[PDB]
Write a protein that binds this DNA or RNA. Structure first.
Ligand SMILES: [Zn+2]
Ligand SMILES: [Zn+2]
Lengths: 60, 88, 50, 237
RNA sequence: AAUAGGCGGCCGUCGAGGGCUCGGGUAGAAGACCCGGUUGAUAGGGCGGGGAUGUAAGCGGGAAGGGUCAACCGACCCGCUUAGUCCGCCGCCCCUAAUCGCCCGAG
RNA sequence: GGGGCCAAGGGUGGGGGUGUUCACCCAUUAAAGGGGAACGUGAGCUGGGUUUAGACCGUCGUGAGACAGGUCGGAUGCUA
RNA sequence: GUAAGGUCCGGUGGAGCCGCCGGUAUCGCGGAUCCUGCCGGGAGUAGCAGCGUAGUCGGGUGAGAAUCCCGACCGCCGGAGGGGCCAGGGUUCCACGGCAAUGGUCGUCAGCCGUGGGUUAGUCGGUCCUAACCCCGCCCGUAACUCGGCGCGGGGGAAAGGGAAACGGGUUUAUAUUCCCGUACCGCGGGGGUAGGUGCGGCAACGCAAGCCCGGAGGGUGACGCCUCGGGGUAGGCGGACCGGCCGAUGAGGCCGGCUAAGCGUAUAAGCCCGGGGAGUGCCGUAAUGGCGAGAACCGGGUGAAAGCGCGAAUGGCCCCCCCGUUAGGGGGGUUCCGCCGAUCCCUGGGGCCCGUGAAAAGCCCUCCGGGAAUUCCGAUCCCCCGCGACCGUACCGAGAACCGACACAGGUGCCCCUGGGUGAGAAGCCUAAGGCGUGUCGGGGGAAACCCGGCCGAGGGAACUCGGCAAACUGGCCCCGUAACUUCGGGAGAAGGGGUGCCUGCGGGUGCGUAACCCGCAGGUCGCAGUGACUAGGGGGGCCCGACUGUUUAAUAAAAACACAGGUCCCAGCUAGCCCGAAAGGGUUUGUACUGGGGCCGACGCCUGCCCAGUGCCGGUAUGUGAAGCCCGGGUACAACCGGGUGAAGCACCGGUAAACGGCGGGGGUAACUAUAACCCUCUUAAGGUAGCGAAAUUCCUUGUCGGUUAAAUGCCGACCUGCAUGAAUGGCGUAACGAGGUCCCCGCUGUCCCCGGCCGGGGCCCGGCGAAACCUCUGCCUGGCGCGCAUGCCAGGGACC
RNA sequence: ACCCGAAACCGGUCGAUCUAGCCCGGGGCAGGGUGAAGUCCCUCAACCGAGGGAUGGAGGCCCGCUAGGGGUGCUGAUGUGCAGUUCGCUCCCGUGACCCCGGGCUAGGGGUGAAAGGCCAAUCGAGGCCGGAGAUAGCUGGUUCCCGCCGAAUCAUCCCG
RNA sequence: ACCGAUAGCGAACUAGUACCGUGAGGGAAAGCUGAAAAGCACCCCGGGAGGGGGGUGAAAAGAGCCUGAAACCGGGCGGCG
RNA sequence: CUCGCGGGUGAAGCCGAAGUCCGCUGGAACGCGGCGCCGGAGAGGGUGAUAGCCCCGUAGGCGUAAGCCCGCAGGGUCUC
RNA sequence: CUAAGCCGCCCGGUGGAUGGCUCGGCUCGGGGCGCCGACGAAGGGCGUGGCAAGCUGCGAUAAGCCCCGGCGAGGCGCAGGCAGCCGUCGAACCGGGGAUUCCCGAAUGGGACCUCCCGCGGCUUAUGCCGCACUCCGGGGUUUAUCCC
């Protein structure tokens, strides 16, 4: 196992869904927080200086 | 069948309609009879049924017409005698 | 799938409306310069982002 | 290396937490302000089996209207009347201050300090012996064989805890053990450090044998206290 | 067989000799080889021979017994019955198809 | 029978224990010869021994472990 | 021009470009298993088989048909390849018009392309309640936080848990409990009348319409585990009669249809209960357990489920017949019983098991407490009628092509819920009805081979094969008889071994009203090689090692002797404890309390577990020595730094306990008597010198030890010896019934494993028509003897060779 | 610092749809066999006691292609596969320490582990993502136009050399 | 005194777009007709795609559009065979 | 401080000279030869070729609401 | 007059190099301008065109609406089409000021397994408006509740 057969058990609830704040499909639905912006867990946006995606968004 | 009806809390009956089709009817299991407060013995004069069936009936058709309808007659006599003896 | 929240249904509707061919009169207006757009999708092959 | 089971238990993960929602509730005495200088009578309503208690429990409805859960003593009768207070008769099921219990009596559910709620001698089939009664302390012999001094105003109940003698019957079946320990979420089955890996246990290794004496100092740090901890002696005496 | 042979015959300076197509295995992975091709028994068909199983369907009679000890039912047996069925074997009979047609070829 | 010469056309087989080559043994036989070919031959086969990862015993080491010491298990790709 | 290169001539092209001097630079291509793009040989080759081998004949369409459509015939699944419906998918749904591309071939076809359309709710689900659990506010910690956290207050948390209410007929190309028709129900509010406020019948259990509004308390229900059994009922099925149709010979016989929802009204069964009654040399009762002066037999009576019955409801659905039929329509009949089997589907009761105890809350009903009006008045849980019931989902697949795995993937997800007839114990195997399909999708040809993979058989011998009986074969179901060593007395056990088995004609027995239905025996006749005739369907026995047993393990080379287990035993801890997480706050064990919590080792069961505390470790004491800072004293410094001494905790030194703590258990001096043997036996190096057991062993080097058995032959196996290189008592010793896809040896039987291989079946291989790649590739490619980096197609001398 | 290549180390964050463990709520396992405790009955003798038949349904019991689960041998098919773990026959468990589903918790020197260094999204003797980072190496490979002139060395001392 | 579409920012253009991973996050390819569409009216063949004539344009530069190298493939020509 | 006034600056923006003169090639002159002009403008771009004078623009100048800045004048406060 | 095959030239196919071009990049002395938000920001979701998919712009007044000023005959975006409409009562376009500005989002009256739902009070006839998060500051009331304005 561990391969093709195990990949067929992905019919359960998705781990991440659309986020009401950032608009990305990264909202952890079971834990109730976003893995992209931190919505539902932090008042301020989730930004890290080792991450370049928020700069990619604006071509900065 | 639907997953909600796949549960055994529903009772399933196979019924054939006048048009010849075969359908499955579902309904909820009836509650158990009321029991005595003290000795836990079955009561009388209290019909079994769901809340809708209870509300379908009038007041006098849901409990016997005697004091302390929540106790069996033996416990009722016990309590009444004890109370009067204590009073006197 | 049978039971859908309204917002997800609306997003699916928007994607469905998005998926369509380029108008022939638009092709004529651009003089065969604009033929296709990046948002074309095949349901069995290209899945929605959500 | 990796962590030990005893270390992992300290973090309170669901693998190690007590499922304290299947049980019947906490068993503690009525607040001391009710018991002191006033005796109350209660009626036993029902006797039940508490999933994790090692002893049966009982419900008591008191004259003042308080419903409480108590550890039922051996021989308790449903519908029986019990008393809690300083002026209660000496009998099984009654709770008395330790200063009012004649010497040589068996008691259970002894308060460590007056009003705490009872801490000592609550397992099934256990009792403690009241040895002496002094103005400053009451000496009681506990199941472990220790003579402990209690404040005279500590509250205790007369009798013995029901359900004694369990260990007479063997469990026989690994499945019986499985259900027994699952009822309490106690770690079972258990591994052996000698057959663990060296990364996992101090005794681990390919050769199944401890490489060091198994008596560990009391000053050893966490992650090292395994085997015989601070053992004065070992072996068969 | 680079000394790449000998002989008889036919043809050439339109034309001998071949190929595809045709009915078949003394043959066979494709090719190739072999018989026959109206100058005919190559295959099919008809009849006969010789074989392999083992006595067909149908009918008549009997049948342990049952049944009103009647009518009627009955596994099975006997006679017509060396039967019936089949034959990747053989002989005789041109009855059917081996026809029409196309192509290379030395000078 | 013992020793030796010419002679390589042919044969030189079957079984028991052992992974065995070898060696030993059994009944036959004229004989049951020794070797080379990448210790011929795994894009021919088998995988018993050997040489990973699991595990047991003995010995050595405080220990992790080790043993040209035993012991059980352990994959063999191909369209020329 | 030695050259890096330059310049001229002839074509294409349509817009910029160069000589010389002096400066600047991402300034010069064959490699880097270099990077990006394109294109080659492999190649018109492999693949388009294996797990379900499926098509054929007429007709139609269309330019074009093996592949599309209709009819017939032959087939496949038929406990799913059929029916219904989640999650996931997201328009794949429906009609029409099409074939540039996609579809393993073709295509008029489509889950493809283009154009239009499709999802209708008071009753179905979310919405409401709460469970495990999560979040926010205060509070404490943190340098700090979006970080960690106990306690309070608040909120969330199930589309299969709890939880108000609807069924049937018809309708669309595509929606139906949603749309139309018929007939109902629940929630809220309103308008009349009435019961009651102020009423009755029963000894009783109880029967009743049995006041209204607000707040509170109590009780019940909601509300529950596993195993097993009785009783009642319903789906579904079987047989017979009789109305219609089809087939059949317009014989016998066979097949099809003979149907009935919610909602209203209505009763008993079991349990429980009430009144009378007054028992034992007992009585009554169940499938079984059982009940009785604490009230049994026996009489009456109350309350109590699933169902059935009546309306709903025959005009509806179904079957049939007739007049019309260019087309479009219109009418007339049946739709009735009996007897059986019977659920895994419902209702209701017994009984048994737990060192296992198998949820909460909203909601609903009843009673009781106080409070508020009501008299030409108040007023229903009763009867009749009227008004309002919001928001979101609702199409379709639901999988061998609509999901995940890059795919129209033989995997996984969903075997998630259900299964007519015959044989049969059976939801097995086989055949078949309904339903579905010919799309587990390339077709055609053929003694058309060799060879490969699946299958069948095989004379004589029967393991001679092989590391090893790997693979295959033998036995096989049911009934009767009959069953060993050993044993933990339960087992071993279906040990082993032997006999029978079909069909037909009748009798007898069980339960039964029944010649209904299901089982159990007896007698006779008879056929074959074979009667569990297909299908289904154990081969067996005797030794040894390991592990007691069921169970778990390296997903993807190890399933085992490894792990676990019940049992044994040791250690810490009396609670603010013991052990543990953390930076802290606080926390786990803890809704706990020695029959407990935590920490090791061995590992069912039987008999037992010997010696050693010097070594290491742990524990207790610590008189005495040493022992840091701090403090004190003297010196020194106009003050300090600095030097000397005193006090001196823990820890070490020191003393004692402790081996089911780590681990060890030799050597000689010797030994004498008989020759070896040396056995008892006495003594020293350091703590003691291996006890009971077992032994060439999963431990033994010499080693294939020696002796005996097994074979004709024995590096094997079993028993024994002891010389144990280098066995041993809880890192346990020895033994052990039952158990094992564990390793290992032998015997009967069986067989193509082999002597020695030979036939046959289906699928590939081969040819033809189509779609069509990849691994790989310095260029090329004959040999003998040599040279060479020491094993060359390419070099040297020779040989040979048409493509 | 002429250009390229490491295994690795550190920081912050993301994952328990696979899989490991535990909590809450649910669905499922044809058919047959054996026969534990319990409760009894009959025939004769009766000082003892012998002989025979019933009922009852327990079990980490037995057979079993029910469903479902596992993966022993063929070291079979396939092995540029149907498939980056599959298929067939054979085989094992199949009322329990059983199988499965929805809602939850445990997160990287950490979790979980009937203990195999196993599992933690095809990755596990320390996961993935991004950043430190163009890390470093005495080790391997590469380094592009022509002609002209002269033209070596692998040997002495010292270095964890 | 920078680059001139494999260069220059990843993006000269419907570019942090399409796409890959549950996630954190990773992240392309793709410019040019002509001066003016004057973008081929009509005829024959073909089911269609398109082919041959004939027209437009200075030049098809014919939209698969400025130039059109090499690799590779097909035909003719010259040489060997 | 501005009931008031003046000025500066300040959005879009406005003005701004000189050939479309003959001949040749050309599909089309920005080209070649000839004849001219402006220039505080021979920077750069487009226009059917390479254009000081075809067009934009440059050389040089102008205007602008609100806002901002400075000042005049009047009314106050405060400091030595 | 040799079949396959090899090299060379010509033509043709395949491909996209080279050359020329550039509304895009990169770098830079000097110059200008530098914060937006509860009067609800930035990022995002969904809508919006006659034919309209992407981008761009806008928000149910939805490639737009109104007022002052500049320009002066065309205009309806990238984007070369059909049809139609707007403009001399001055459009398009440009600078300034206004109006509209769905939903989520610090998101705030309470909730999010789905950027959608459920609430409580005054005004209003009703339509329909205005208030209600937490942690505080300066005040008032009383119920002393951190309860209300
Ligand atoms: Zn987010
Ligand atoms: Zn009672």
């Amino acid at each position: 196992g561990s391969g093709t057969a195990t990949f067929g058990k992905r019919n359960s609830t998705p781990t991440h869904i659309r986020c009401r704040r950032c608009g990305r499909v990264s909202y952890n639905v079971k834990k109730g927080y976003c893995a992209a912006c931190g919505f539902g867990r932090s008042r301020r946006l989730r930004k890290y200086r080792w991450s370049k995606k928020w700069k990619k968004k604006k071509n900065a | 069948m639907k997953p909600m009806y796949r549960s055994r809390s529903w009772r399933r009956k196979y019924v054939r309609t006048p048009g010849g089709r075969v359908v499955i009817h579902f309904e909820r299991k009836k509650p158990k009879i009321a029991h005595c407060a003290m000795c836990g013995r079955p009561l009388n004069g209290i019909p079994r049924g769901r809340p809708v069936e209870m509300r379908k009936l009038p007041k006098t058709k849901k409990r016997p017409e005697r004091p302390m309808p929540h106790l069996c007659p033996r416990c009722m006599r016990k309590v009444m005698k004890e109370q009067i003896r204590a009073q006197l | 799938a049978r039971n859908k929240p309204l917002a997800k249904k609306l997003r699916l509707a928007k994607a469905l409306k998005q998926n369509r061919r380029v108008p022939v009169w638009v092709i004529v207006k651009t003089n065969r310069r604009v033929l296709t757009h990046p948002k074309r999708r095949y349901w069995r092959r290209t899945k929605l982002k959500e | 290396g990796k962590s030990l089971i005893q270390q992992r238990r300290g973090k309170g993960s669901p693998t190690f937490k007590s499922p304290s929602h299947r049980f019947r509730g906490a068993v503690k005495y009525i607040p001391l302000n009710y018991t002191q200088e006033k005796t109350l009578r209660g009626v036993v309503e029902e006797i039940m089996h508490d999933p994790g208690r090692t002893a049966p429990v009982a419900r008591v409805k008191f004259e003042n209207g308080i419903e409480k859960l108590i550890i039922a003593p051996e021989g308790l009768l449903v519908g029986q009347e019990i008393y809690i207070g300083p002026d209660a008769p000496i009998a099984v099921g009654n709770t008395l201050p330790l200063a009012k219990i004649p010497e040589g009596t068996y008691v259970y559910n002894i308060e460590g300090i007056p009003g705490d709620g009872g801490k000592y001698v609550r397992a099934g089939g256990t009792y403690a012996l009241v040895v002496s009664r002094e103005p400053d302390k009451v000496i009681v012999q506990l199941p472990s064989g220790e003579l402990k001094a209690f404040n005279p105003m500590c509250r205790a109940t007369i009798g013995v805890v029901a359900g004694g003698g369990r260990l007479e019957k063997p469990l026989v079946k690994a499945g019986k053990a499985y259900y027994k320990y699952k009822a309490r979420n106690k770690f079972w089955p258990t591994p052996r450090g000698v057959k663990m890996n060296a990364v996992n246990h101090p005794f681990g290794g390919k050769e199944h044998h401890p490489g060091k004496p198994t008596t560990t100092s009391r000053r050893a740090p966490p992650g090292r206290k395994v085997g015989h901890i601070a053992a004065r002696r070992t072996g068969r005496r």
